[PDB]
């Protein structure tokens, strides 16, 4: 029978209670957080953000990353993301949420291997929808350092949004997780400040993430903050670079250093959105020195 | 009638399970930590060390600072010290704890008075007391930059040792805290960084404490540290100093950057005992510059 | 499948008498010689291993009047470094500590998980059940040379089978090696030349065998071993033999080429 | 204790033209390196032993027109030499 649309869907949130409790070999943490925002995708073919699910990834969670400080292992017992609608009943397109077990995967690549993904949801734009991920009764180490995902990530969200039209909504929506993590074991508190050189060393939690591509003026690393938010970033270059820290394409970016042998650089850079960084240039691939990103 | 002496008396020390609950208002944290060792003191005269009594002190609690990031008042509900020895039955002298409710004021400058405090406890070092300091319910702000002690500690513990002999033990003891602290409100994760200038701005947890001293050279700096453990410290001189960091009275201190205008410098200073630290010396009171201290 | 009970002697803890504690790790795998000395030899012929029961003693060797303590803590990531200061030593869970003249025990909770017995490149993350802490601190100068030993009590159950690793170790000069981890070389350029010394991971009396292609700056010499001998003659195209025994980790021997990783090949085995 | 199981390689047999048998003994003691290869590791670690079960296979090599016997048979004394003639090779218990 007859079946309405209304002009638009007022969704009501309101930052619940997070809910600790002690058990015999930990804590049970429940609580929700806030991923990312969506934004219009005027193309047929998606695009695409991923998130990877794993306690102590400043990317996905922002409260739990310490709590699971003073911890070795968790398991996410019940897990399961939200979407809240933002615009209105005459925006076009879809959003997708999959899910996918493997964290190293690069998302799909064309709409149809995206619907193949198992427990692929997606709705209208301007409806919500639950995705809920079964879960398994396997620990594994919080996220310390460099180390194969497929031993340590529990998973990887992935968010698709294509089909907008022209004129449609900025941002479309925002997802939202809803865990509740085991977590076990006990150590001293670890500091949380990624520590590393460029030879492919990386202690402490994923902030960032370099990448080297060969260039005319020489070796750029890009600097990929996976985060949103405030970050700074200091650097040792041991033989004099081709040129120092550059805003590459994030937001508010300053550095107070010089770029020579033996010289410190201190950038506090600013992200808008995960994925913005800055940019090295160096005549030498693999090059001699430390960085250390903090959420500063 | 007869009371026996040992040659020494065995404590059974074992790290228990913090116990952490959901409450209306926030969380209800207990555990218990190590604050320090107290060292052999060859004088008759007390020799102190002090540990500030607030969530997010370092140099006090290593566990619960992490927890009481993510909140923004606290009461401690129950608190209470204990003494375990380490030393043999033959050590003279004596083992003083004493807890003093404003955390600004110096420790006592003869032992006279230092008997006078409320409750304040003692024994010989070779066997074990507690000292159970009376709470209140009053809240107060977690540590956050720079604010009156008196408004947001909630007090300051006191260990004095003196009248050892020359042939005693290397060191008599080690406190143990023991508290069950209500967190209360919530706000966004903070950051662990404490970030300030010259200028008496300090933004963040309390690890370090810079004084100034005239000197022929010109005034010196004094980075002090309240805490023992790895830490590091980048340092930003607006107008070139006289020298840059130098080792004043820690271990293990290495320094990669240049000293002069612009300059910056990162620090891993390590150390083994509260109140080590580094020093620098410029021409300039007040220099103007940046500083950031961090547990790595 | 085989069930192996046992008690081994890991270490004996020796006097720390500067401020700092001192920390001293032992990863626990079945084939770690640091670990291990008689569990090696059989997990050497299985390439799959799970704790049943694990736990750890302390057997005090100190007189009465000693001063300072001791720690034996468990950590399940065997990546991490050893922690930096005593808190966080006692904040690891299951953390037992006493005077250095009592005897104490660390039970270790064993999960029900199989893991490959460790060959020494793989992450110690998916191989490695952990690995133990044992701090020493607070000791004056008059108290004894060593406090006490730490000993494993375990009960694994190894799985599998294959062919027996090599019993030793024989490697090339800045190059390849294989068999159990007995000793690791370090290069360090000097005066004379290249200095070329061994480290013995682990504890007993050893046989170390070289072969030079060209004559070197000077022969095998003990560098902080608590014996040597050496039966050979350096010269181009020759062989020195020489037995080493060793107290602590750490101790060896050295030598002298003056030149970048030389040519020849060495042969390491705790006899 | 301890009880371990394994499947090991004494030895590979070899022609003889002469038509008198031509024996080679190997000692069934865990100790024994003629016989054990990988146990021999483990059994210096005891000092007793106790052989639960026991069984010798003998796989073929060659082709299918070679000629002549091939024989095993278990002595329970360590210390008589093996015999002298093919009937006492076949007296001896279990000889197949």
């Known amino acids: 029978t007859r079946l309405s649309a209304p002009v638009a869907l007022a969704y009501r949130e309101v930052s619940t209670q997070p809910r600790v409790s002690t058990a015999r070999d930990g804590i049970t943490r429940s609580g929700s957080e806030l991923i990312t925002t969506l934004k219009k995708n005027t193309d047929t073919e998606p695009k695409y953000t991923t998130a990877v699910l794993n306690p102590s990834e400043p990317g996905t969670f922002n409260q739990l990353i310490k709590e699971a400080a003073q911890y070795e292992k968790y398991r996410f017992t019940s897990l399961r993301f939200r979407y809240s609608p933002m615009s209105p009943s005459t925006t076009g397109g879809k959003v997708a949420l999959a899910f996918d077990r493997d964290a190293a995967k690069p998302p799909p690549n064309d ?17 919500g929808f639950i995705l809920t991920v079964p879960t398994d009764s396997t620990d594994r180490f919080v996220a310390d350092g460099i180390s194969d995902p497929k031993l340590v990530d529990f998973g990887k969200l992935i968010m698709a949004t294509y089909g907008q039209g022209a004129n449609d909504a900025a941002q479309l929506g925002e997802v939202r997780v809803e865990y509740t993590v085991q977590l076990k074991n006990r150590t001293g508190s670890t500091s949380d400040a990624q520590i590393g050189d460029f030879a492919g060393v990386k202690d402490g939690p994923r902030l960032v993430s370099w990448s080297k591509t060969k260039g005319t003026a020489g070796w750029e690393h890009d600097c990929h903050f996976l985060g949103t938010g405030n970050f700074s970033l200091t650097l040792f270059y041991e033989k ?24 410190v650089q201190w950038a506090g850079v600013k992200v808008a959105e995960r994925g913005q960084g800055v940019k090295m240039v160096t005549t ?13």
């Open 240 to 263: 004099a670079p081709v040129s120092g820290l550059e805003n590459a394409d994030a937001s508010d970016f300053s550095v107070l250093g010089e770029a020579a042998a033996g010289s």
């Open 284 to 296: 030498e691939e693999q090059p001699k020195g430390k960085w250390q990103a903090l959420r500063i």
């Open 111 to 127: 709409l149809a291997s995206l619907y193949n993904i198992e427990g692929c949801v997606s709705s209208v734009p301007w409806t």
